[PDB]
């Protein structure tokens, strides 16, 4: 029963581990979300501007 309890404790550990691992995936994913958005915004401003620059 203590080994059953040992399974239970490792289970709660792994459950909160799954919480935080989903969180790590989400942290990189939202880091990626902001990267594509802001990097896209920067390259787009830069691109239409350089278009404007050389064509001007």
């Amino acid at each position: 029963l203590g080994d059953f309890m040992d399974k239970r404790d490792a289970s709660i550990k792994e459950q909160l581990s799954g919480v935080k691992d989903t969180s790590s995936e989400v942290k990189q994913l939202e880091e990626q979300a902001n990267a594509v958005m802001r990097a896209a915004r920067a390259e787009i401003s830069a691109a239409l501007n350089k278009m404007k620059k050389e064509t001007q």
Binding site: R8, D9, S11, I12
Partner: peptide, 28 residues
């Protein structure tokens, strides 16, 4: 005697209450 009656009552209260908090932690 019934010292142990009232005592087993409140003491298993504290004991199983603490273990109730332990399994409650396993849940929460």
């Amino acid at each position: 005697s019934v010292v142990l009656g009232v005592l087993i009552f409140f003491g298993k209260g504290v004991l199983s209450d603490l273990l109730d908090n332990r399994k409650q932690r396993i849940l929460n």
